[PDB]
């Protein structure tokens, strides 16, 4: 019904909070957060990056593979005959 009223039934949870003025917008932002970078940046990086690396090779790989194929005619047949 009324969006919040009839949502669900919940029992014996307790919540604790302050006015925003009670605290600061940078509670050791640098110091505390900078480590957190790794645990997330390491978490997925196992799962994600490598496929692209393969691509990047192909990028140069085929290009190079392309390049000779045309660029030099006096290659397979040199200009002799």
């Amino acid at each position: 019904g009324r969006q919040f009223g009839h949502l669900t039934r919940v029992r014996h949870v307790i919540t604790y909070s302050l006015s925003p003025f009670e605290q600061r917008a940078f509670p050791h932002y640098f110091s505390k957060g900078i480590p957190n970078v790794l645990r997330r940046t390491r978490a997925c990086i196992l799962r994600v990056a490598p496929p692209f690396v393969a691509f990047y090779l192909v990028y140069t790989w085929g290009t190079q593979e392309f390049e000779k194929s045309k660029r030099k005619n006096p290659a397979a047949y040199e200009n002799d005959r």
Partner: peptide, 14 residues
């Protein structure tokens, strides 16, 4: 190589 063989297609522009 072109010089005498320029009779053939050979050209140095490349």
């Amino acid at each position: 190589r072109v010089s005498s063989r320029s009779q053939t297609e050979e050209d140095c522009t490349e």
